[PDB]
């Protein structure tokens, strides 16, 4: 038995895998506290994961590639909810109320003239 | 230093410098160029270089050799 989910966020992509066993969390061949640096709140990977009881009976395995290290945490949250929506056929409805099934449509900008990347339209003249 | 290989003068000027001393007490030789480097092989005398309008007299110094004649001759007017 395996539960599985995938997520894309800010030019990163994640794969999340859940099995029965003794409780642990593994990410990119290390433990969770040894990734993401010192963190501000460390909560977006935990947000949906409390709903099936935190580190009680599930064996959690993660692999994530690309983007900034903040974007990798966002890709993992969607990978967790894509796996949880097949752990019980009613769980998707409570994750919807919390907003953990939603995805952004805010990808990287093109040109479009005159812009430095996405803003700063020319020089605003002189006095 | 400008330059590490070593500066040179062209044969038509070398032919004049090797016949400039002599006594070194004559009227300044018109060497024209402001690019010439006063490097230690050069002999101590007074010479004349072009400012764009006329020629200006300058001396080949012994207290310093790390210079070109454009550092001593003024070539621009009114500034």
């Amino acid at each position: 038995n395996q539960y599985y989910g995938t997520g894309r966020r800010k030019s990163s992509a994640a794969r999340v895998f859940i099995k029965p066993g003794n409780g642990k969390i593994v990410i990119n061949q290390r433990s969770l506290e040894q990734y993401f640096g010192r963190e501000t709140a460390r909560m977006v990977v935990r947000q949906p994961l409390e709903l099936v009881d935190m580190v009680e009976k599930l064996d959690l395995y993660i692999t994530v590639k690309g983007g900034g290290i903040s974007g990798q945490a966002g890709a993992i949250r969607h990978g967790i909810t894509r796996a949880l929506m097949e752990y019980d056929e009613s769980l998707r409805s409570e994750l919807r109320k919390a907003g953990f099934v939603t995805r952004d449509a805010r990808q990287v900008e093109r040109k479009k003239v005159g812009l430095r990347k996405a803003r700063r339209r020319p020089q605003f003249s002189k006095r | 230093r400008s330059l590490k290989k070593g500066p040179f003068i062209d044969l038509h000027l070398l032919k004049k410098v090797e016949k400039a001393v002599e006594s070194g007490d004559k009227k300044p030789l018109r060497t024209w160029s402001r690019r010439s480097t006063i490097f230690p092989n050069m002999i101590g005398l007074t010479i004349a270089v072009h400012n764009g309008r006329q020629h200006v007299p300058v001396f080949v110094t012994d207290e310093m050799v790390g210079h070109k004649l454009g550092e001593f001759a003024p070539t621009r007017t009114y500034r």
Partner: protein, 150 residues
Amino acid sequence: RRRVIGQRKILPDPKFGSELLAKFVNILMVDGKKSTAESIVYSALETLAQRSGKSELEAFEVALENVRPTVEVKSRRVGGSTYQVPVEVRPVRRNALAMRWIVEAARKRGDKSMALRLANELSDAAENKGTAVKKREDVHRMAEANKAFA
């Protein structure tokens, strides 16, 4: 005419159940460097208790509920004329402004570490003795003028 898109939601703090206590990591932030902005958050409350701080698990509430503004300035138009009035502060901003005055008191003023300066201002807020900053004196110096309207 106040036309803007709907206000920006945020989630309550995962340890303290409040959207205002989640705000401290944005205070004394520069260069977008939130990493170092959190490095004085909750880590100065013991330095504060080892001065004059009391109730160390809630000694941060002094900048939220023990020092509170209520008067704002200046002008109201009435037809062709302008007159001075004391105005009311919006209730959420009114609880979240005394925690924001601290920038001059920590970067333009203050001795040794930014953490000691944070503890220095939270000591004074427990007795409301906080030395006034330009972002408060730009209101408080003028708030007692024209007590008769038009």
